[model samples]
Target: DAHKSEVAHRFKDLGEENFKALVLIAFAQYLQQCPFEDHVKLVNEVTEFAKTCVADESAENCDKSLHTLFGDKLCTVATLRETYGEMADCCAKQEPERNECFLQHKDDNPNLPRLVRPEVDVMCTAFHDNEETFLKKYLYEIARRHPYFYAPELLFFAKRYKAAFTECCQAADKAACLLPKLDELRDEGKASSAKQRLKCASLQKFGERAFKAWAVARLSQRFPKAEFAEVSKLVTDLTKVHTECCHGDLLECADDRADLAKYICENQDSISSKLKECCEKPLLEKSHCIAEVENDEMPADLPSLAADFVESKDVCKNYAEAKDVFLGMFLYEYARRHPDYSVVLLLRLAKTYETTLEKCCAAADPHECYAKVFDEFKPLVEEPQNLIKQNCELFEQLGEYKFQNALLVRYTKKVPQVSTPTLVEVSRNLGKVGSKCCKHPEAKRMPCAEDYLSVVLNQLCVLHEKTPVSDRVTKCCTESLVNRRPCFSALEVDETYVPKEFNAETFTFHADICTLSEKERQIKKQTALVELVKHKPKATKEQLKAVMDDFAAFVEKCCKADDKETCFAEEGKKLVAASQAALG
Candidate 1:
């Protein structure tokens, strides 16, 4: 605590003014430490200070004191000038000799930028005096002094000027006097060497002019119906002029010119009439007529009608019985009163019902609702199946109609075939068939008609023995059996007998006979081999033997060994034998 007291007494001699100045300087330095956020804040704060100083006497005097103290430390000229002007205004309000003070300093700060407050006041006053002249003078002055900084202000002024000009022109009969100041600006802009700058100026001039022309034409009472037409033509012409002058290098400009010309000619009457009528009768009448016709033709039984009316037109009427009556009338009229209400209408109604069902299902539980509906409609839509059968017949008739149309298209190019009708009909018939099949348990066992046809075709080929002549199969068998011999080759029997105590001379005379007759015998015995291999485990050996014999017979009948065909046949036989082993 004694060490802290010693440090506090060390700076007790600092004066209030010096200490305050030091703190302000420190704060200013702190603000300047960061470049981006600090600079933005500085500019905003300075702008606000300038505005306040200019508006209030005390703030202006404070600004003068800050400026005198800070002097050249202020970074920006715009901020300095604004602060100076605001301070000067405050001094003028306070002192009678303020004019003399201004005169003394005005020459010293001849290039000081005007504060936003004063500039805005001057601009407004000028606008009240003569709007077009004020816009021209003010924009030109701003552009000359701060070309980039005052861009937004210049644009706003230009817009307001254009609006005022248009109003004045439209209020007057025939034409309003041309703004000389605007013309001068245009001339000066066109004379500039910088293309981009020139373009900006040109855009500003032409855009304002075009807008003014359009506004004038639209608001003109002289040609009410013709006003829009005339204005449209004027807009088109001006747009073309702008394009030709500004966008000469663009490809679409030529097309645009032609298009605009055509549009001007075509829509001149309608465009001109828009101004005079004020209300769009054609559009309103069409909408009203459509709604009336739709309402009159709508079925009464549709419960959705009430909801739709409420949603669309905010019509809230509670008449359940009337709605039911209307629905009955609609259905009766559809069935008997109007025969033209064909299957198309029924399908449309079904789609509407389906959409409603989906919406309700989403709001509740889809499966539960579906089950309930299914239970309710089972007798009508499914049970007995005659109703569905009738519906299927109707769909078939619809398909017939489409089929005839397709036939017509095939024969004659002039006729257009309605493919949708055929697809819809087929879909309906398939759905009906599927429903019926679902109910019949035995239907699952039946082969599909198409699959049955395929099987029949295969059987016919087999019965006729019309073997495919392709490389895939040969002689109604695979390529594996051309050269392989039968499994039983001539079975050789070795007969050599020797006594227990044999002499060398007797051994030399011993008979050794080897017979090859059994091989051929075995093959001959199995010549009716095909019948033996027809069954399972009992016929396993016979099956293998039969297969081997078949390969041998095929080779003998069809090919010779060492030939290309015979080699292929041998390879095929090996493959078959390997496959049989694998299966086993």
Candidate 2:
């Protein structure tokens, strides 16, 4: 009872079991592994720690007790207790003589901390080398925080990949560069953990679903299946290799840690190689490979779109969900490879698929809805000179269709959008292009919008063309073309003179179509009409006055209500009478 009192006083933070356990583990393997001559040095350190524990002393400036660390969940690992007991016996020989043996050894980084595993070694090195290598450091930290059973296997991974991890930067750096872009997660917290501590992931091209494509799978796939039953692919890959090559009662590798890395490494490379080939092949051929195909290729150019987003076992190849979302992930992945285009990916390009994002995941061809986006975007990204934001400035507004980004470009860029063209779908695509790029009817004509408009509308006629255009785009397109013509006059294929009609009422930026109130819209229409008339003198003053009055009755009759109703038949008589009075 008195011994317990002294022990409890010295180690108030530890229990009797903990005291025994700490002492047991403090006889470290490193100390045992040290040269027999150096056992004296390590043993002296522990003896001093022991003396301090037995007697009341200040804890400050003293090294942390290994006892505390190994006291918790760490000691529960199999085989550790046995190793500790053996070392405890050997190390306690007068603070231990067997320790001298560890000091004489020759090996890797002498500056590295005493961890023998690969991830620990990598973590220690990458952290001191550069914190800018946050993602690189992050991977090491992940492995370091894991359990001991995962040690040697993960070491196999860490040893071979830290080299690749070292050079990761920008989009070409793949997921290491892109995965940190948790920006679009809005506040999911991943991207915010980045170097700048900002929300730039969704703002950057390489984020979200893109992360799932490569780095996530690279970091997580075959990442020790929670259940041995699930026995992941890397495990399966290794198991298959092991069963095929290393088995039998003669299996020396079953017991030897040295050969395990070699065995896993040998198969890892081949598996990665096989995985790479699939990511490189056409989507049609990749269905059974490391990557997968969620849907058929777009009719425009299937091969090209697949090339925009590439995947391989070394990166995105997963233990599961491999090739799952199809072309849905291509945008994020492609953005990872080409970061310059990332801005469009989030803002311009993403909006183009608002409806698709809602519906495509449930469909077989996850890529089907947006595959065309990649198909069209492939060219604008091809040249080094084309990647600059300025090269994309004019096209920024209209590039979404062909390149799926207006600020991006080129029938050279024209492409059909919806199976049944919704004007809103094709309009902003047409309006994104400004007059600077569309002034000429020929060479310099805005290729993305103007050319696609040409594709959709063959006749010099009404807004009711084959595609159902959003009134918003109809208005914007009118605004967009103002530098060139007054109305549908630009659509006169034969170049014949036509009446001009586009104006603020039809194309105001206030909101959607008819965004202006009756009086406000009337004033705006008359102002715009007068300006149009000044050019060719189209409408007479009386005509303007008549239309202005015509609109007043409509507003008084229809738009006066705060909440909208389906129809106004209940008040038809008042409307007709008011409208006739306006004609007066």
Candidate 3:
């Protein structure tokens, strides 16, 4: 803890060189001991120190000091040059020797603290060569196997190593070239043990760096005249290609392989043919301007004109009209030049025409050209209707007629015996016929047989109501009675010999010659009475009295028997003696 505080205090005054040195010293010391919880604490101190140096302008001077301190002492230039040579010399000798050297000195180094400045430079060189390789092969191996030794030191050294390498390479002349070789070394610097290999697997992150370095080198060399913008686009394209193809097992698929082959072939062709064409021409040549123009076959002037229009609002109306006119002219030119432009061009032309028509319609009064417009629109509307009608007619000829007729017959049968077609039914049928006719060419014209058919249905309802089986029979009987009521009133009256109880002044009479003959009337009334008695077996006294009274009145008024003196007196006596008949 005291050492940690010392290191923390050093961070404030240390230049980048000494700061990195301090980190390396602390990390090296930590790696010599057993792994502990303070491992991250030590590592984070180093990273924080580096971050401080990165933010400070003094970082550059600090980096120069780091080079001077390390380059002359612990990790000299000779050591790095020898390491590089060893890496390329023989794959057999390099791996074993390097691993042995690291393992032997990893925990046993007593001069670690004194060699801090030089170790800082050594680590910087290794990381610059290949950061992933340095971490995996040396630092991480120590952290895992001699975890007690190096775990605390690993992150600290790793962070300083990264920062020092970044600073050094940024200053180096051939840094771009060195990066790829470094990455290659990192990839090739695998250990023998399975555990070490697993650790190495985690550190294998140089593929993207290798790709980026390669792209930057190639683009700078091949496209020296390319603008910064174009180079940026090319870099993006290269990155995309690397991501899609350079990683993963997709390289094994047949289709992917074929696609790769096609891409290579196309790229080769483009380089050999199109690239030559592009480069041979002057930058300001018409061909160059034409190339800058999108091969979209649109108006060559559109982009600049559109840009001008966008930039100037005062001329926007004129610009828009000009733009439209230019667009139309461009399309016409394209259609003429590239007659085989496929359906896509045809659709574009159609859209242009439609737009033109819309603008024309919007600017002009539609009523002024209504007749002409209608003449044109009428056939368009009628064509679909005609087609539908033709289809329906064909269906009718092809056995659907019988099916439809059967449906109508079924509907007719479902009509109730006493039911008549109402106005609602008329309206419903009108709608149905209208819907059916919508598919006919004459749909919008005057009504046809279908409309007449609905009228016939309404007439059928009226005719059905007049049939003998309907209420018209009762209406006829009622009319006949009304007509004969006057005749019934002409009967002679006789009042001489009226019974005292009769009271002719009080008696009220209304008569009709029953539409039915006497026999028929008797049969009908008796039948009605029988029906009433059957339904109401326990008739009330009031009902019985009413029936008796009505019968007596009928005898008196129509039978003419009451005019006879004997009949009148006998009836009056019978009524008066007959158990006090109450008039209810």
The prediction achieving the highest lDDT against the true structure is 3
Question: Taking the tens digit of each residue's C-alpha lDDT, what string does model 1 give over 15-59?
Answer: 332222222322232222223334335434544454454445354
The residue ranges of model 1 lying beyond 4 angstroms of the native Cα positions read 1-120, 128-133, 141-159, 162-262, 268-584
Q: What are the per-residue Cα lDDT tens digits for candidate 3 across 193-267?
A: 222222222224434433333333334333333333443445555555435322221212212333333442344
Residue 369 accuracy (lDDT) in model 1: 40
By TM-score, the candidates rank as 2, 3, 1
Residue-level error in angstroms, candidate 3, position 421 = 84
Clashes of each: 14, 43, 5
Clashing pairs in model 3, backbone N/Cα/C closer than 3 A:
31-149, 31-150, 34-148, 35-148, 39-152
Better model by TM-score: candidate 2 vs candidate 3 = 2
Error of 3 at 177 (Å): 15
Runs in model 3 deviating more than 4 A are 1-122, 125-132, 135-261, 264-584
TM-score (all chains, Cα) for each model: 0.14, 0.20, 0.14
Worst 10 residues of 2 by lDDT: 407-416
